[PDB]
Design a protein around this ligand. Structure first.
Ligand code: NA
Length: 129
């Protein structure tokens, strides 16, 4: 599923991401935009052989099991393919554990490089939230 901007914002708000650990909703929409272009089926391979999955590009090195990242962890206790669903519940619940691990949203390289220090509230402008 490719989400619309306000559609994703509404779904993220319903699932409790607005101001989670102090990050306003615009941060999460901005991160999703530049991580996956709002596409739940997005995948990208990393140099160490791990793979990033879904709308927030969650990494198989630490967070999910894809059967092909030997020596890695599965801290969200899910198969990585669950992160590609049109239902974003698994991605949001796993994202909540990542952002709580001490580094905040700096865990997402696209957020630090393209969202942090910008007017992230612009990403929800116009939405009925
Ligand atoms: Na893993």
């Amino acid at each position: 599923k490719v989400f619309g901007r306000c559609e994703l914002a509404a779904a993220m708000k319903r699932h409790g991401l607005d101001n989670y650990r102090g990050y306003s909703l615009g941060n999460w929409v901005c991160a999703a935009k530049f991580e996956s272009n709002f596409n739940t089926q997005a995948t990208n391979r990393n140099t160490d052989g791990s793979t990033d999955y879904g709308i927030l590009q969650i990494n198989s090195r630490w967070w999910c099991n894809d059967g092909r990242t030997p020596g890695s962890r599965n801290l969200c206790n899910i198969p990585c393919s669950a992160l590609l669903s049109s239902d974003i519940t698994a991605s949001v619940n796993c994202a909540k554990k990542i952002v709580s691990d001490g580094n905040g949203m700096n865990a997402w390289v696209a957020w630090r490089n393209r969202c942090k220090g910008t007017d992230v509230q612009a990403w929800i402008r116009g939405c009925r939230l």
